[PDB]
Amino acid sequence: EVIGRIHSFESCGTVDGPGIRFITFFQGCLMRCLYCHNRDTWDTHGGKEVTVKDLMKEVVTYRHFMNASGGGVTASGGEAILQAEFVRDWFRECKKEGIHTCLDTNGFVRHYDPVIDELLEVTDLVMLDLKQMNDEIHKNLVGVSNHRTLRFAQYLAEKNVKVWIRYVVVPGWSDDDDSAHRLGEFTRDMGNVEKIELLPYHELGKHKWVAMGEEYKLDGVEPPRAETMRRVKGILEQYGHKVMF
């Protein structure tokens, strides 16, 4: 059996529509986003060990709210795709129970082994984070190159995998016009992208950086204005996709 390392899990009402979402926050991430609100999910060797049998015992206690529309399970974190084999086994069990599965991933896929296709086969929705198309900024914002994520995005389109693009709009980092145009061009021909979702930056989770004795880099940075959000949205809409925030 495959052993998963999780930070925590939680049941919570879906953003819209009835029913609940059972989210498992997997432990471990290899990106270093300055704005991470789950800083305590980076350590790959931390968290708690669980099995798929352990996880399904919590899932089934919410079964009557997960057949409801928008309900199901979501693998988040942290980066769930670092533990693709476990998430594949977990989703495989949810498909046996008629459960909708969602993968909340940064797309930092470094190796294309068969476990990736196997995971995607039992994944209904992929929420992919494109943090910055400008790789010069991306390195300063995330600590790594966006090449792996951009290649993974193209892989999802080739496989016609349902994808929601998530763009965290941070003032001074990803609120400029050029970066928005680059995002619109890159995702224009991806028919599998149902919509692009602009997430405004928030300072939630700053205490997690302080608990680990590390300075929060984005001190003083405020959430984007409603005008900036509308401006980026209007730019992205010029490339055909449904854009909402």
Ligand X SMILES: C[S@@+](CC[C@H](N)C(=O)[O-])C[C@H]1O[C@@H](n2cnc3c(N)ncnc32)[C@H](O)[C@@H]1O
DSSP element (H, E) containing 206: helix 206-211
Beta carbon of residue 116, minimum distance to Cl ion (angstroms, whole number): 9
Rounded Cα distance, 28 and 66, in Å:
27
Cβ pair 5, 26 in contact under 8 A: yes
Beta carbon of residue 106, minimum distance to K ion (angstroms, whole number): 6
Q: Is 94 annotated as a binding residue?
A: no
Segment 23 to 62, residues that bind Cl ion, using CB under 5 A? 25, 38
- 10 Å Cβ neighbour count for 73? 27
Q: Is 33 annotated as a binding residue?
A: yes
**Positions in the binding site for ligand X (CB under 6 A):** 29, 35-38, 76-79, 104-106, 129, 166, 168, 199, 201-202
Q: What's the gap between Cα 27 and its chain centre?
A: 14
Cβ pair 172, 217 in contact under 8 A: no
Q: Which residue is at the shortest CB distance from ligand X?
A: 129
38 interacts with ligand SF4 by CB under 6 A: yes
- Tokens representing 97? 């129970």
From the list K ion, ligand SF4, ligand X, none, pick the one residue 182 interacts with, judged by a Cβ distance below 5 to 8 Å according to partner type. none
Q: Which residue is at the shortest CB distance from K ion?
A: 129
**CA separation (Å) from 102 to 20, 73, 107, 143?**
13, 6, 14, 26
Q: Is 102 annotated as a binding residue?
A: no
Q: Cα torsion at 175, 178, 181, 185 (round to 10°)?
A: -130
Residue with tokens 């929420």: 127
Beta carbon of residue 67, minimum distance to ligand X (angstroms, whole number): 25
List binding-site positions for [4Fe-4S] cluster. 29, 33, 36
Tell me which residues touch K ion (CB under 5 A).
104, 127, 129
List binding-site positions for S-adenosyl-L-methionine. 35-37, 78, 129-131, 202
List binding-site positions. 29, 33, 35-37, 78, 129-131, 202
Tell me which residues touch ligand SF4 (CB under 6 A).
29, 31-33, 36, 38, 41, 77-79, 106
